[PDB]
Amino acid sequence: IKIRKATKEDWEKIYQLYNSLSDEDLYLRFFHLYRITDHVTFLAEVDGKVVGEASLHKDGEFSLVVHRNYRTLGIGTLLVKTLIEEAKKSGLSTVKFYTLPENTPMIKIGRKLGFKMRFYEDEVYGEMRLT
Numbered sequence: 521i522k523i524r525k526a527t528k529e530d531w532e533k534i535y536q537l538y539n540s541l542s543d544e545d546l547y548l549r550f551f552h553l554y555r556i557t558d559h560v561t562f563l564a565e566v567d568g569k570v571v572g573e574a575s576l577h578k579d580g581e582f583s584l585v586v587h588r589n590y591r592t593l594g595i596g597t598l599l600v601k602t603l604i605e606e607a608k609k610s611g612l613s614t615v616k617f618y619t620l621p622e623n624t625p626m627i628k629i630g631r632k633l634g635f636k637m638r639f640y641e642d643e644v645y646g647e648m649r650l651t
């Protein structure tokens with residue numbers, strides 16, 4: 521399980537990962553964007569195949585997705601920890617995420633990592649002040 525920073529040359533690999541995900545997975549991966557309508561990306565690789573992708577934006581917001589067959593192995597948690605580390609190195613004041621209330625796995629990660637949660641019927645908001 522290797523976690524590395526993504527480069528422009530990884531676009532094709534990420535594209536293939538996305539093509540294998542469900543519409544539900546993609547909806548959750550870009551939840552906030554769907555709701556309201558530079559960045560650093562990390563990938564989780566098994567062999568030479570990207571099985572997980574996580575991105576951090578300049579405003580502290582992050583998101584990620586792990587292929588269904590590679591879930592519950594701790595990858596999502598490791599990717600979020602990687603993003604938090606990146607956020608601290610880049611001097612961000614806060615990191616945050618948005619998802620659906622039914623997304624138990626993500627909320628579990630958020631809570632165990634220290635994120636303060638705000639719940640609503642249409643969405644949930646997690647946030648952690650770093651500075």
Ligand SMILES: CC(C)(COP(=O)(O)OP(=O)(O)OC[C@H]1O[C@@H](n2cnc3c(N)ncnc32)[C@H](O)[C@@H]1OP(=O)(O)O)[C@@H](O)C(=O)NCCC(=O)NCCS
Pocket residue numbers: 544545546548549582583584585586587590591592593594595596597598617618619623624625626628629632
């Ligand atoms: C949310 C997501 C990244 C989690 O990734 P993952 O690799 O499975 O994460 P982890 O293995 O670190 O597990 C996270 C926790 O959720 C739990 N979990 C997994 N499946 C579960 C299920 N069906 N019910 C309950 N809990 C579940 C894990 O057991 C673990 O428990 P813990 O936090 O006490 O250790 C993954 O499910 C995913 O890609 N989902 C679709 C995209 C998405 O929702 N992205 C979120 C963006 S903010």
